[PDB]
Amino acid sequence: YGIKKEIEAIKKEQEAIKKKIEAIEKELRQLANETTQALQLFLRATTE
Amino acid sequence: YGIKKEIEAIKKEQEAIKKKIEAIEKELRQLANETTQALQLFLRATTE
Amino acid sequence: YGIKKEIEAIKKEQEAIKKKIEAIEKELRQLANETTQALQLFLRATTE
Structure with a gap:
């Protein structure tokens, strides 16, 4: 029983x-x- | 003993x-x- | 055998x-x- 419970x-x-x-x-x-979305924002920002 | 050690x-x-x-x-x-901090920087940068 | 298989x-x-x-x-x-690379890009961008 002990090993079973273990x-x-x-x-x-x-x-x-x-x-x-x-x-x-x-x-x-x-x-x-x-993080992919966050980087996509930056990639969008550096074309403004 | 063996099962115990196992x-x-x-x-x-x-x-x-x-x-x-x-x-x-x-x-x-x-x-x-x-990553939140890093994104906060960007969000700060695109208002400069 | 059962405990062994268990x-x-x-x-x-x-x-x-x-x-x-x-x-x-x-x-x-x-x-x-x-994320480090992505942040490095931003750090590169805000010196352009």
Whole structure:
């Protein structure tokens, strides 16, 4: 029973980690988009 | 004993992973702040 | 055998996670470089 509960806890931790990574990927993509947009502004500005 | 040492190693790996993720979140936040600041400069420049 | 296969699966998941984190670090570094370059452009532009 003890090893079962140990393994169960570990797999709970992994699923939580996998979701943390998912959130990090989300925020990383947004940041990439924003920085691309921000650079597009500059590229628009240096033609004004 | 073998399974104990296996589980122990796995939980050592998880704690290390959790800290890696922590460091990634730190650097991601800094990068977001810097990019916001960098864009704020531009927004300041196109009013000069 | 069951616990062995469980532990084996968990360690497979950890290696996959470690590589996901590796890819995230790669993309995070690139993004930092690009944002630095993008800001360098602006710093070049406001001297023209």
